[PDB]
Design a protein around this ligand. Sequence first.
Ligand code: HEM
Ligand SMILES: c1ccc(-c2ncc[nH]2)cc1
Ligand SMILES: [Mg+2]
Length: 379
Amino acid sequence: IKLFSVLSDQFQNNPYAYFSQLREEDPVHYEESIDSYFISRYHDVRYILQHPDIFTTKSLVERAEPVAKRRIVVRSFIGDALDHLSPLIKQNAENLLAPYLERGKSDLVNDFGKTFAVCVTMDMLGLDKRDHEKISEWHSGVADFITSISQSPEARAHSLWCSEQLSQYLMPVIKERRVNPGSDLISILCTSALSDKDILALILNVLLAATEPADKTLALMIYHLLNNPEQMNDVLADRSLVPRAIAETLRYKPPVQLIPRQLSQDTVVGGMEIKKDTIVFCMIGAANRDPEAFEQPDVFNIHREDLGIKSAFSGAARHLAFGSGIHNCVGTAFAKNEIEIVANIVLDKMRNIRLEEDFCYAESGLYTRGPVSLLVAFD
Ligand code: HEM
Ligand SMILES: c1ccc(-c2ncc[nH]2)cc1
Ligand SMILES: [Mg+2]
């Protein structure tokens, strides 16, 4: 059945049950609802993410809207700085965890994760960490505008308010640093090219970008490590394993699930010929589960020889969770080091971590996916 819908409740309840069938039967799957093709095969996807002259993306300055080489520049402003934020990402985790020790339990997504990911992004932007609640809130409100297929008139209103709220918060902070630079990212954005309203739309995009996926990765890892208790023990003993666990969780259950692209000319991918101006969706989950790229692909295995940690976190990595080529996630380097730091602390701090009694595990999200909650218990 090619008639099946990939925006359907049924798809969303468990996408990994259906990818297999999309590849090998309807790889360039047309969705009759939007005017968009969903591409599910690894090589078909990777070629698209390789060449953004044919499959153009949306640039790193314009608004993340209703859904050239500052990359270089931003890349090193993360890269050079990620070793200055190492003690702060470190304190963030420790500070945020302290409430939940002794109680002996926590929900790593609701009690801990969302709030941690936000505080990191805030140190990277140099905003005042006291305001983390305001921000997580507004940050979701816009995240929604983007993630959602459609919205209620209440939500759409609320999302618009959040952007309004976000703008009027950041913008004075932009001018303050344009004239008195700090040593944060916003501070650098205003040094040696860019205008005020442009620097805002960039900050807004980095905020959206560094925040949501970080959350989800740490949680997906903890969950897949506790679900293979013997691999969890593997990580507990030799900590150098953390990155592979990060990586394999990335291939396994990629936080960002779809990558879109606009189509320049008329071009063929797979068996199907497409047409101009059309948005096609890369199905990352589907690609990281293609036998063609990974053997035993539906097995969480941190020790898999076909992962390749040497490059799991670069422009030319095996999995497509960070995208591919010259448009790969700008903070890949940063993503590694951030998640690494928490994971390590979590393990250090929640001795004898286990899943809570009667913990029923569930995931949510079409564009970006992750656990609704992860209920863990500890000493
Ligand atoms: C859990 C780790 C992360 C994952 C899996 C991830 C994944 C991705 C993916 C798949 C893309 C789209 C590639 C494309 O279509 O061009 C992307 C874009 C991007 N990422 Fe990440 N990312 C992560 C963490 C981060 C962090 C920590 C930062 C900032 C330090 C960051 C900054 C960006 C930026 C600026 C973009 C460009 C998209 C835009 O224009 O808004 N990412 N990321
Ligand atoms: C909502 C939140 C974040 C994203 C995103 N796109 C690339 C990296 N992160 C997309 C939608
Ligand atoms: Mg973060």
